Design a protein around this nucleic acid. Structure first.
Length: 613
RNA sequence: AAAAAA
């Protein structure tokens, strides 16, 4: 259709068009086929963006199904390191991170004609960066159309930025959500959610419950606990289809959240912020929102940015509530006090760009000739402090000139879609003749669930993981795993025998192919160091010198820069072989401020590789 | 332990 007619006319008339309304099916599904019916596929590709990987491939499957064509043909997608397309692709669904990474290659995005954006979700640095490059390709490509979805409120900001583009309203029925607060604050959200989910299931009418947890480890612990609490009520109680949802989860398991449970069994979808996307699960009436999210927080006092558990903002709590009243009138179970919401919780979430390290961002820009640092019209302004903070970081790495211009190492690191810390040490391993092993170690660091350690066999998993522990350090331990995997002919029963995640190695093997490509393409020689593993140590140190730490004889370690006590993680290949000097990869903050993936170094390197100190 | 993305 009734307002389909209006959209296709306004899309032909206006170059940039903002859109306020529905999400997923109704938005990206409906919209895209209308333009397909208007013959824009003849002029070039339609590039649709999605916040999450799962949704990018889920709308992409939906559309190819509707369109009739095979998936990966006319309708294809692109997620992670997989290009599930063809030259026959005419409708390509991808993540904002993907289009950005493509625009870095072709800043005129000549492959496309129409660029659909799902930005009615959240604003990530990738989105902030993309929005900038697109503003330029709008002036650079008079022919190119650009639809951008925005949240009802958000809409004014997007219009103003995109040359005062029209804000097209898509109508529909909104359903009321009776919000209910915890009488008094809970001791632990995890358990409380399981108290809630149990109650809701047994007492309340039909409707699938939706829980917002922090991470996999927590969702895993929620589901098991929820299952044994369910099974305890015998065959009397009706079935609950406990559904875990987090990005490490296989697609068959991720997509089953969208599946409508039997007529008597109700389902609980225990997700991360994976499910905060226009990822519109049908038949949800209950939301169990504890008001917590795993996100990055940045301190200018020391350039590092790490994941904390900052509570979800009021603006977010309100959309989570909205996740109930979509199929029909819902109920939002806020696991906090009304006092919490109006006081303890922030009004609206701080944009990624301010709460994250901007070195991997400055490098991206200064690389592609954006040395100006003002010209790129920032939709979410980055504070000049953290900008010059990040600028300084690259000088020490050897990526920026004394004046602030580009360097050889800088331009060489710029060719990889990697963190400057990882970049320096992979570009350096070429100069240091340990590139074969550094390609291994970078790809292995990229994947996270490397080792299999179940709760039912905690001890056995440690004894199996122990066979790989290097006297050298955790980085070389990862190398030992991947190298003994190829040794044992990429055997799946070898992984089962050794307690190694065969999927996580298979994933890491692809990134290694994907990186060897950039390597071989830009003439970076790929060479081994064989038994001379000290070559690897030196090269790791070249990139992670900022992450140097020294053994405090009283307790743990002390940072070379902060001088804040940091401790080797309980898992570490060094956790008991702890040495005087080390370089850590990441920093997990839990019980203690644990150093993630540690390797031994000789302090005599914090000058051989970091004279800018 | 990595949230999300590459």
């Amino acid at each position: 259709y009734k307002l389909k007619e209006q959209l296709v006319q306004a899309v032909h008339d206006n170059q940039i068009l903002i859109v306020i309304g529905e999400t997923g099916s109704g938005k990206t599904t409906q919209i895209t086929q209308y333009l397909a019916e208007a013959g824009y596929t003849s002029r070039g590709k339609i590039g649709c963006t999605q916040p999450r990987r799962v949704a990018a491939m889920s709308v992409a499957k939906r559309v190819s199904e509707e369109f009739g064509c095979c998936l990966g043909q006319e309708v294809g997608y692109t997620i992670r390191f997989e290009d599930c397309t063809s030259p026959e692709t005419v409708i390509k669904y991808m993540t904002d991170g993907m289009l950005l990474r493509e625009c870095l290659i072709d800043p005129d995005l000549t492959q496309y004609a129409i660029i659909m954006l799902d930005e009615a979700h959240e604003r990530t640095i990738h989105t902030d960066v993309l929005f900038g490059l697109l503003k330029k390709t709008v002036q650079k490509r008079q022919d190119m159309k650009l639809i951008v979805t925005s949240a009802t409120l958000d809409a004014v900001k997007f219009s103003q930025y995109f040359y005062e583009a029209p804000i097209f309203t898509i109508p529909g029925r909104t359903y009321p959500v009776e919000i209910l607060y915890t009488k008094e604050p809970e001791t632990d959200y995890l358990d409380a959610s399981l108290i809630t989910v149990m109650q809701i299931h047994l007492t309340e009418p039909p409707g699938d419950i939706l829980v917002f947890l922090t991470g996999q480890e927590e969702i895993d612990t929620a589901c098991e606990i929820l299952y044994e609490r369910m099974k305890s009520l015998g065959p009397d109680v009706p079935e609950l289809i406990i559904l875990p949802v987090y990005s490490a989860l296989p697609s068959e398991m991720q997509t089953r959240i969208f599946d409508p449970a039997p007529p008597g069994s109700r389902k609980v979808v225990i997700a991360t912020n994976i499910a905060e996307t226009s990822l519109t699960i049908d038949g949800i009436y209950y939301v169990v929102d504890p008001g917590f999210v795993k996100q990055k927080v940045y301190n200018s006092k020391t350039g590092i940015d790490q994941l904390v558990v900052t509570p979800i903002s009021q603006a977010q709590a309100k959309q989570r509530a909205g996740r109930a009243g979509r199929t029909g009138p819902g109920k939002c179970y806020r696991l906090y006090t009304e006092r919490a919401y109006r006081d303890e919780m922030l009004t609206t979430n701080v944009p990624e760009i301010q709460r994250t390290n901007l070195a991997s961002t400055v490098l991206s820009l200064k690389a592609m000739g954006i040395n100006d640092l003002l010209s790129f019209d920032f939709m979410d302004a980055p504070p000049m402090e953290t900008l010059i903070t990040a600028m300084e970081q690259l000088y020490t790495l050897g990526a920026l000139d004394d004046e602030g211009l580009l360097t050889r190492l800088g331009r060489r690191m710029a060719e990889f879609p990697l963190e400057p810390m990882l970049c320096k040490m992979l570009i350096m391993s070429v100069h240091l003749g340990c590139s074969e092993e550094m390609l291994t170690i970078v790809s292995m660091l990229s994947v996270q669930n490397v080792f299999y350690r179940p709760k039912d066999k905690q001890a056995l998993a440690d004894q199996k993981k122990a066979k790989f522990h290097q006297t050298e350090g955790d980085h070389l331990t990862l190398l030992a795993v991947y190298n003994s995997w190829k040794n044992n002919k990429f055997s799946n029963p070898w992984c089962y025998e050794n307690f190694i995640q065969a999927r996580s190695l298979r994933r890491a093997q692809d990134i290694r192919k994907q990186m060897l490509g950039i390597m071989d393409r830009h003439k970076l020689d790929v060479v081994s160091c064989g038994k001379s593993t000290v070559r690897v140590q030196k090269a790791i140190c070249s990139g992670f010198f900022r992450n140097a730490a020294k053994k405090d004889p009283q307790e743990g370690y002390r940072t070379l820069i902060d001088q804040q006590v940091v401790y080797i993680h309980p898992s570490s290949a060094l956790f008991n072989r702890q040495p005087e000097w080390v370089v850590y990869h990441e920093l997990v903050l839990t019980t203690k401020e644990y150093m993630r993936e540690v390797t031994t170094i000789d302090p005599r390197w914090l000058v051989e590789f970091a004279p800018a100190f």
